Design a protein around this motif. Sequence first.
Motif, mmCIF file in Angstrom:
data_model
loop_
_atom_site.group_PDB
_atom_site.id
_atom_site.type_symbol
_atom_site.label_atom_id
_atom_site.label_comp_id
_atom_site.label_asym_id
_atom_site.label_seq_id
_atom_site.Cartn_x
_atom_site.Cartn_y
_atom_site.Cartn_z
ATOM 1 N N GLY A 4 0.631 -1.297 0.098
ATOM 2 C CA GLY A 4 -0.041 -0.013 0.066
ATOM 3 C C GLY A 4 0.857 1.118 0.019
ATOM 4 N N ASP A 34 -5.355 10.120 -1.368
ATOM 5 C CA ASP A 34 -6.212 9.531 -2.586
ATOM 6 C C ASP A 34 -5.628 8.188 -3.214
ATOM 7 O OD1 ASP A 34 -7.763 9.523 -4.932
ATOM 8 O OD2 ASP A 34 -8.518 11.254 -4.065
ATOM 9 N N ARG A 35 -6.186 7.300 -3.006
ATOM 10 C CA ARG A 35 -5.665 5.843 -3.584
ATOM 11 C C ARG A 35 -6.738 5.030 -3.806
ATOM 12 N NH1 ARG A 35 -1.656 3.953 0.771
ATOM 13 N NH2 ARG A 35 -3.035 5.548 2.047
ATOM 14 N N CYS A 36 -6.391 3.663 -4.265
ATOM 15 C CA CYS A 36 -7.285 2.785 -4.515
ATOM 16 C C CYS A 36 -7.184 1.334 -3.637
ATOM 17 C CB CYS A 36 -7.339 2.048 -5.921
ATOM 18 S SG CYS A 36 -7.879 3.562 -7.176
ATOM 19 N N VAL A 38 -8.190 -2.560 -2.184
ATOM 20 C CA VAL A 38 -8.708 -3.881 -2.505
ATOM 21 C C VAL A 38 -10.099 -3.901 -1.816
ATOM 22 C CG1 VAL A 38 -6.905 -4.842 -3.474
ATOM 23 C CG2 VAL A 38 -7.230 -5.175 -1.063
ATOM 24 N N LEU A 113 -11.227 -2.402 -7.033
ATOM 25 C CA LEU A 113 -10.384 -1.387 -6.362
ATOM 26 C C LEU A 113 -11.308 -0.083 -6.318
ATOM 27 C CD1 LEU A 113 -7.438 -1.759 -9.143
ATOM 28 C CD2 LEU A 113 -7.024 -2.159 -6.528
ATOM 29 N N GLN A 115 -11.938 3.344 -5.136
ATOM 30 C CA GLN A 115 -11.321 4.688 -5.076
ATOM 31 C C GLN A 115 -11.828 5.419 -3.674
ATOM 32 O OE1 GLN A 115 -9.580 6.128 -7.671
ATOM 33 N NE2 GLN A 115 -10.038 4.209 -8.758
#
Lengths: 117, 199, 304
Positions: A4, A34-36, A38, A113, A115
Amino acid sequence: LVTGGATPELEALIAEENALRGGYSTPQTLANRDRCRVAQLALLDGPFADLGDGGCYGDLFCKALKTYNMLCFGIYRLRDAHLSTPSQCTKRYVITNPPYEFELVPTDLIFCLMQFD
Amino acid sequence: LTRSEAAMTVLSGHVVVCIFGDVSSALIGLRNLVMPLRASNFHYHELKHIVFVGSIEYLKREWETLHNFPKVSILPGTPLSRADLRAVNINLCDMCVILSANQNNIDDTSLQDKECILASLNIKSMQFDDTTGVNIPIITELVNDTNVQFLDQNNNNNPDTELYLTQPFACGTAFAVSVLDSLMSATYFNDNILTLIRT
Amino acid sequence: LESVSNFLKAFLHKARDDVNVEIVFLHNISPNLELEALFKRHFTQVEFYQGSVLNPHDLARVKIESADACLILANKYCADPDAEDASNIMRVISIKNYHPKIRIITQMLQYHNKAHLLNIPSWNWKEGDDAICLAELKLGFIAQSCLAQGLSTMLANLFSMRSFIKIEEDTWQKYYLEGVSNEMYTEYLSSAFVGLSFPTVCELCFVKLKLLMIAIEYKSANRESRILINPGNHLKIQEGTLGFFIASDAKEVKRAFFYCKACHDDITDPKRIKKCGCKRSNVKKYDSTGMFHWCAPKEIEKVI
């Protein structure tokens, strides 16, 4: 994917003091958030309950990508989903990159994924 | 000394002794390192403040023959720690000593100098804001001659070069222990050589 | 015997098409009879020599200067992981000293020991040198499985090679094999996709080219190349971007690089679509970077 955001600056800061260093919130700090992530989404209770009633995998993939920007890895599906006889088994197996013309059992989960909001 | 206390105290122009000791480890006799630096031939202001970086459990074993010296300080920790070297102000030291303590292990042949090489490269790779890590004067004890060639990682040299032709040995950065066996042979050939060297 | 057995069963799997490369083992310990037998089974791809990579002459013996790569295995079941990690790092130092321009893949027991690799100036991540951190990778796999059950199995099937099996009868094995038949690949994106959003290019690649686009490598000058997983609407694909897909075969991936619409039709026929010549207050809750949640230090007795 697994760690991550394994950026090299985290490596450097952990190397310097052998510990995580707390930081004051800044616009850049909140921007790095700001990521994605699982995640597993269930077909029955979600907004796409209709597409769980035997709908195609590609249709739901496109619907998730267009609106929620959700990239679907594949299907986590009950082992006894194809069994016509009733079954109380809750063990589920993994289908990676299902084809577009894939029937969707209503009691299936989707790897995705999500957001950040 | 704690990290914060050592950082607070100004100790520039000092000598850092980075050692790798433990309760099980054999004593290296640190007194023989501090005695030549504590000779009366120097004035009191000439004396260099000596700071030890290593496991305190080993220093307590070594502390019996060290307390009677004027300016000796001990910072518990590990040489491989970057923060410990930052607190000591290792970029301002007169000389940083890497001692191949914990010698009681005979792991493989050249693996004995793993910690010395790691600490040397760690010090060389540092950066400081008022400089680099390369300009820091370092003396590292090594037991295998080939290991000396690992100190000048930036420079390239042939694997067939002798120990004395290597840059780390020529510059005096690396101290190889084979020189003691060479001194033994020379003393056999001439008894006065050892007396002069010791004096 | 255990490490060599695992390495050979994963590396030398029959489905591998790149079968040429020969493995040369260098260790100072004379192998036991079982390990000699194991070497004898793969005698025509596996060779052994007695020596230490610490010794430069032994490096010269195995011709490591012309070797494609050097793989350093770790003693996972060791009393002190730090000592094994330091030994492996010093082996890396020896190999780099003998020949600076060689790819090295080394296994690390502890995460914090990877930093020492930065201490070697000849160590280059961009060239291809990498550290397989066993603890970090394994625990990350387990944590991401805690988020989503079966993701570890997904990735393990993605990057590994498995023998092809056909199952006729209607069993869950059928769908599992239809899933595992896929593999994860990477390729350069075509110039036709420049300027679009990631959702548009991913949708087009999945529907028209039947490739499920995972990620993009983002290039910049101030910051090095960074991998982005499912970029949102806001980011746009620049020129010459690497992209990670999941595809059934390696031949299927190339359709992304050769794709256009200025020469490619609207018909969904990937065989006829692919063309060789086309178009031409102030409390802190997060870490310093803010990539992880952070909390003020707490004593062990509080959480007991």
